[PDB]
Amino acid sequence: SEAQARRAVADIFNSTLASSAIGAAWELGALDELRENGKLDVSDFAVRHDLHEPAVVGMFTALASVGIVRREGATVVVGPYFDEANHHRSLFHWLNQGSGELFRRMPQVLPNENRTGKFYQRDAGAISYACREISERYFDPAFWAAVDGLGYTPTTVADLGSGSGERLIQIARRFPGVRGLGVDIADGAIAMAEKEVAAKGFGDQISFVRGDARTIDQVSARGEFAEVDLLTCFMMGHDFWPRENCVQTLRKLRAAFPNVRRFLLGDATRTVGIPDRELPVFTLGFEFGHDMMGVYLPTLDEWDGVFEEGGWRCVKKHAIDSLSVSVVFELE
């Protein structure tokens, strides 16, 4: 029906603005106001946070357009999809604020002749901000379970792809007096993690170093590697692949962290067989995005292959069904 088609396509258009707005409204404080008080006064909010009021009105109207919010007067009210969208807001942020420039440039990123050198760009600072909540909301119950089952109190912990630095911080809050080292390949991750450990008071327990975990022998921070007895790596396992490169890299890690006992690896994985009209949140963005970036994404079943060959024993495996098909491995 021509009218159903028109309403659908309009909804597709507006969903773009709503999607971009969710992450923005989180970052700026609006989603938190609404969860707390069920409602807010748009002018008041705009003045409180010193925001351009007409743009604010738009942001909320974009949210309203798809049911996240409902406007009555100068009041914004929690809408029927508020609780779902708010729960998942870090995913929208990662898609838009974080990875938005990648998808924007689709027509320049697909042609083979452009897929050379640095042919896409994302905002590493924003990815770090999103992934900090993605960790908490989706990965944490399995991560802490694995931490509870270590068998030992760790001393020096190393985190590959540290991002916001928040994992290392939370580990230090639990094990007071541990030392932390974060390796991330991106200047914006490093910078955010440094400001964050500084603000939060751990500046002499936790350091960071810019570096590539795939070329771990070339990372500049020699000193502390051999003292590390806990290794963590979250949301970047797939950067180790294809299969050969992953095996060789896993072996380099076992060699450069001789005294690591447990290695906790958490990641999302390429799904199989999900019908197109039923893709849950995140899945399509994760898979399409990485395919655009020329970054290999293994199935869960591919991972099983590689641990023993890379010189590691897989002791425990946790399913995370809350975020596409995700997993935590406890390796030894």
Place this chain on the structure above:
Amino acid sequence: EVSEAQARRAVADIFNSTLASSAIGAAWELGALDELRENGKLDVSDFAVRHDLHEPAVVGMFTALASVGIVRREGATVVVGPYFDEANHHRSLFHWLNQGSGELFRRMPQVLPNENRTGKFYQRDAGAISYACREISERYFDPAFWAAVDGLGYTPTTVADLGSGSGERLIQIARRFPGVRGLGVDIADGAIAMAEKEVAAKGFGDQISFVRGDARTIDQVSARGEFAEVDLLTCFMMGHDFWPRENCVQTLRKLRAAFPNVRRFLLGDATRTVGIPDRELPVFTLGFEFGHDMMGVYLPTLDEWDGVFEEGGWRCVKKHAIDSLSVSVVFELE
């Protein structure tokens, strides 16, 4: 519970709709849409090879489109979906939203705070905007624009286009009037570059030229000698940039003075709507209003345009309604 399941689907639809939206503009640009339109279907691998594209990304693009109904995948093949004809109709609007204006909306957290609203506080892609607007013009404004051209009362010899963009409006004028000289003014280098490329390639290199400038201070624009020859003036999709009202009045006068031999001035634009319920917003409107509000650019209503012309030194002779794109309009001025 129920309901929790409905909210879950609706939010997932919003997430994937972002990907579909961005893919609509892209599949347009790379020719997947034209090909699906012609043949009703295509082979994804064959399409990747013909156009030398990274095949895994190509699968994502069609999968993104398929996630919301625009297309369906059958095996290794792609087939027209139920929302195909409509998304294809409005594809230039998505291109405008994504490929053109996407940086604006991406940076909403850094664009809204007043403390940052200084200097170059947002970025868009002027080339891409030109590309999309070329089709927006043909798809939504042409009927009314050629009605106006037909009813000029004379045959133009020199046309100036303000906010020239792709340069395609000047090209089409020249097709219709083999005599005419054309001059386009745009404030953006990406528009100029695009339009110089287009006109050379289409063979109109010696008839049409372009100059970088700000139509708001038209009076201070370099190629002034050529302006006095002009007998048709056009302006499409940037008239709001002349606002607020006070500014629009002064600019209207500078144009009158900068173009003394202009007989007609055709002015086309989209305007700010009022009272559309949030869940009943059609395509484009929200994007147009929210984006200009983020950019800090005034958007007059239709009535607001009516006041201003006489005060700006012009008289409105004919007015066309365009309900195919938000609320849009073409004015014939004199």
